[PDB]
Design a protein around this nucleic acid. Structure first.
Length: 255
RNA sequence: CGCGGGUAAGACCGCGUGGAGGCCCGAACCCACUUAGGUUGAAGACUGAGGGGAUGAGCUGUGGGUAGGGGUGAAAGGCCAA
RNA sequence: ACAAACCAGUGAGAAGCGACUGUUUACUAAAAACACAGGUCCGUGCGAAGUCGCAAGACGAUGUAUACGGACUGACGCCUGC
RNA sequence: ACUAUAACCAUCCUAAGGUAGCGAAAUUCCUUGUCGGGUAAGUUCCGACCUGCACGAAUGGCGUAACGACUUCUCAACUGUC
RNA sequence: AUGGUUUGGCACCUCGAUGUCGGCUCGUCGCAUCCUGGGGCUGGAGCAGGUCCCAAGGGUUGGGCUGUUCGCCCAUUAAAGC
RNA sequence: CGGCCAACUACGUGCCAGCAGCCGCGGUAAUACGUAGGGUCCGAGCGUUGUCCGGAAUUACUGGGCGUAAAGAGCUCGUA
RNA sequence: GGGAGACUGGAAUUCCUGGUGUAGCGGUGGAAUGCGCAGAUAUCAGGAGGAACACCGGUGGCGAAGGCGGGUCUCUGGGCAGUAACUGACGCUGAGGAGCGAAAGCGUGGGGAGCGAACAGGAUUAGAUACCCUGGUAGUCCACGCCGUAAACGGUGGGUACUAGGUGUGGGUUUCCUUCCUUGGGAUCCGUGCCGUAGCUAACGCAUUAAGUACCCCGCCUGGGGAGUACGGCCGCAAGGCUAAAACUCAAAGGAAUUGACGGGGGCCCGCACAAGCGGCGGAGCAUGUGGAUUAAUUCGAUGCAACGCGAAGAACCUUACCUGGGUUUGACAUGCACAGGACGCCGGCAGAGAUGUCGGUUCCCUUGUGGCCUGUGUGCAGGUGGUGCAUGGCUGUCGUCAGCUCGUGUCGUGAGAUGUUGGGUUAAGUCCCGCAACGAGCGCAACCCUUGUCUCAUGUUGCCAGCACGUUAUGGUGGGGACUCGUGAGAGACUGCCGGGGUCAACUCGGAGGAAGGUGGGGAUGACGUCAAGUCAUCAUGCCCCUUAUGUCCAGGGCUUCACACAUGCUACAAUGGCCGGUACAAAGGGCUGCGAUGCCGUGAGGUGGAGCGAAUCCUUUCAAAGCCGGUCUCAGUUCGGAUCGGGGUCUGCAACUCGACCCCGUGAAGUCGGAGUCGCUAGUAAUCGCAGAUCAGCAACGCUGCGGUGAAUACGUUCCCG
RNA sequence: UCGAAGGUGGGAUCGGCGAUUGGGACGAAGUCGUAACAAGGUAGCCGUACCGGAAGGUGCGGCUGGAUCACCUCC
């Protein structure tokens, strides 16, 4: 490390002492230092109790660390400047050991500015305690085609819709298939040829709607995280679509 | 163990009965620490003064067992007929 | 001169070693050496492990892991690091 | 920040580099180490320093009441040891 | 240049045996003299020394520490000889 | 003779010499240092030191307190 | 869930055994030690063992306190309510004393799944005896005993009586709604919380569960350290516990609350702050400034933003304040008190580097009292870029053109202080609206000013020329003309003015029409209270101190330009989006009298001669430019790039270009191949790039500064990170 | 007989010195670190135990005299 000292007036021996005292702080800086300068001045007025003024500037990897002290002589000023610079460099570290106690920790305990925001679902929580099923629509079970079902979707502003298919005579549910288009799920999977003709670009889910109970359906919805579950009820034997409502209850659509 | 004091009861504290201990002093008995004598000796390991243990891991009597590259050894290369 | 003869503890302070009573080179060494009560580790599930025996057989033990054998250390106190 | 040492740092090597405790000691050659006590005079003794040639934790480390025909130093009495 | 009083060198001397240091007791000899005795010069004023010649008749202490010889110390003494 | 605490200016000096009961004054322009004027309090006296009481309700009987300033025993039973 | 004892239940962790089964598992902010490939992790079945008891489960219950919940049984303590049968003050407190007393720790004997001091490695770090990771001994567990400490806290000793209430919740008795289901409600006793009177307190706060009003008893305190320490004593196996000083030292240590400041606290916002981009710096040569070194001197000031092409808008001499040397002293220059005068003053010669000295010619007008000049003699005095910007004024920077900073009266608090200035919304804004113990006001914001973008009226010279004539190439050049520009006077025009929609029908906001311009149109001038003892005693002034035969003053020469290095700001480049040559088209602004200076002529070219015309809308700076466009050539090379350095020859200014000017000509032809860590500027006529002009100026170090125009981009998803 | 003084002996108690050695107070500027105060960058403190050049670290139990928890849609 190389230091330049720009003294002023009569300060014999201050330059060497300041150089050798400040150059020892290179190991303290955790990043390479560049062009570290020091300046010594003396107050002309004898009325000042601490006439000597010392200033130091270091460029630690682009970060400017500067300090300034007053003293009665060159030696005291240089020593105080060294202590001040050491404290500043300690507060500057920014390496992991010095930035590990401020990084957000745990999952829910403690909150910080950069702590990860809580993931909130669209629905009101309404935990399993008194969740209940307080919405049961049975809008339409008149047979429809894919295009007619899509239009019945669109003006209802509902992502999924349960109807009964024209060609099959079976219950089916359409939903937005994402970027792939739309997706159709039937109680028993059938190919497109048996399905009534359509013009919208859709795809058919190959899996069949399984048979399961109400509590099992709620458990599957909870452990599978889908926006809804389409299934054949075990007791009823017919189609059913459960979705988490906008109040936290489950919306069971039945024929 | 008993009596008394003490306490709610004790703990505990005094006074007695008791006779424990590889306990103390010290004869027989068993050892052998010091010194002097002896050193062609009274004696092929003793004597005179002192000395240690002396109810025990004690001493001793009679009978018996372990045998040589083996015995036995509170361990010294000790003893196993000077 | 009155424990008149014989008989019959010298005492105190400190340090080292070994806790202590004991044992040891019969015949130049009795000690700080051996042993000891206590501690730890290892082996042994039962004619055990170990030992004496070519084998039978025997001790271990007429015992059974709170028992037996081997090794080191040596009361007791504070400990026993890598 | 006088001088001194070095709380501290760097480096090589190892499996690890001796912690507690003690130290001119039954270990220390230099050595009759240096200081204090004891004596008129103390190479022995006691207390301390640590520079441990070459202490050190069950080949145990440091202490310890009681005990010792063990070793060393001092005192009082006592005496033909003188 | 002397000496064989110091450590040495050789190994002629003894392994069918010549005690190895100090201390005690008892000596004898040399002088390269510590005191006493006789002188010289003094950088000897006297005192007292310094130093050097002659001189071996006599004398040349008791203790502390250490096994000590050696050595240091304590009191003396005419001196505390080699 | 800065404020407590009556009584201010000039010169000399400059973190020195020094002052001081406390707070605190000496850093070329000090009403706090030294000297001069001026002033004030006392006056055959004036100040300093030493000791006791008061102010000190600062051992609180008159006349104090204990949540956070010092202060409720860790909690009960019970002898005088 | 008060305590003790005994028996016993399930989930889960660990380990073992046996199947299926592969190549990873585990761990972190990221990894590595570690485990596994000899079969791990995962999954199933079985077995062994230890500890703790999910849900119930809470500011809910019990207990004197510590503390106490898997289930069942046995033994046992306390409390509450009602009846009031019973005894009849037997009550309260309690020095010492005894007992209980979390966790950790100690002793003996067991047990040991998980966790885990100590201890190992792994990781982070400049260093990690730590935080994080992999293992892991005591211990945590049981039995019998020790110790006797805790933030053992409600930091609040025990008993009693009284002093507004409101509302949760636990337990028990009873009256009335009455279904009598129902926290129905009421009354009452005993607990346990929250809010709030009076009252108390320094305040925070307590407030029927007192920290209120009083009575009885006990414990404890007398400033902070030294110190709950030493000595002595008691207890303890030990760790240690209890009782418990002094010397010395400090002038404070403390409790509550207020205003700031700060935070690796939170929330809401801004800014080329970041993000997306474009061009750079840091690498090379040169110009400039600074540090350091050097020197006789390298004059002085300026040290992050906010010093470092700054004071310096012009250092050869002068400047100049520094050095060497030479002179000078009422002085280089002012003004007053005096004595003598007619000269001061000039002009030539000589000596000197010059200052200066000397020589030669010239000599006052008033008016009699003297005045103007200087001489010397003097005497007051001048003169200091000598010190102190921590004594100052004035001037300036900066936070920051950010939106904030205060005051009057009122109100609250003992007081510092608080409200207003906070809250919701909105804005570029403390801008505004709605609320509000506040009502108003001031400096700040905005507006009023300049420029710029459109139009109207006025306006024609030196400015335009559209329609008419003359023109000679040479063109508004010339007569003429207001028509279009332009020049400069007045005015209009943007005001959410209008419409539609959000909006508390409020501020304000989104879109649309119109217009040249739409929402402070674009850019300026303007910088609140103050901060940083910021800068300036060197623009100037100035209190105090200092020099005064000198730190004043005159002159010559030199220095400020020195250079083994370091930092900063810029310029030129490293080339083909280019170099060179030829042709050719478009600006704005500004300057000019002892200055701009043309035509012509002479030089290759700086330049020389010469002087037309101009105090300038006229003449000159050329009619003005360069990038640009067209044509030719070069062909990816240290080159036809780059220009440094050096040799020679000249011009101009200046008394004088050696130290130390610029430019011109010939030759010479270095580094340099797009530049590490890091870092800067910029949101549109902007960055980038090209040229022109001005100040200072005899000449220039100008590549610097201040302006003018030419050509003219990319990107902005959005505030997580950096700075303010 | 009692009896002052004196002699002998073992203890008590109060002080002084003491080689070496422990801690305390203060000292602008020395060396090594960042422990605490803003969540002080690992919340702090109390009792206890172990470890470490040093502040300190960790284990068990306890206390708040510890900071923050945006947004939060149903109603």
């Amino acid at each position: 490390m190389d230091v330049d000292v720009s003294t002023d007036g009569e300060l014999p021996g201050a330059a060497e002492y300041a150089r050798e005292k400040i150059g020892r702080l290179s190991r303290r800086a955790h990043r390479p230092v560049l062009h570290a300068r020091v300046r010594l001045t003396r107050h002309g007025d004898p009325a000042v109790e601490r006439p000597v003024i010392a200033q130091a500037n270091l460029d630690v990897n682009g970060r400017q660390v500067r300090a300034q002290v007053e003293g009665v002589n060159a030696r005291e000023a240089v020593d105080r400047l060294e202590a001040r610079l050491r404290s500043r460099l300690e507060r500057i570290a920014e390496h992991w050991e010095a930035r590990r106690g401020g990084v957000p920790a745990e999952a829910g305990r403690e909150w910080r500015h950069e702590s990860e925001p809580a993931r909130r679902p669209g629905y009101f929580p309404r935990p399993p305690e008194e969740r209940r099923i307080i919405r049961r629509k049975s809008f339409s079970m008149v047979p429809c085609t894919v295009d007619e079902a899509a239009l019945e979707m669109e003006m209802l502003d509902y992502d999924f819709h349960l109807f009964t298919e024209k060609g099959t005579g079976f219950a089916a549910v359409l939903y937005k298939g994402g970027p792939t288009g739309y997706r159709l799920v039937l109680v028993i999977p059938v190919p497109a040829d048996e399905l009534s003709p359509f013009e919208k670009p859709i795809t058919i889910s190959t899996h069949p709607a399984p048979c399961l109970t109400q509590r099992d359906a709620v458990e599957r919805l909870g452990l599978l995280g889908l926006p809804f579950l389409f299934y054949i009820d075990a007791a009823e034997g017919r189609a059913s679509v459960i979705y988490r409502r906008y109040d936290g209850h489950y919306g069971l659509i039945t024929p």
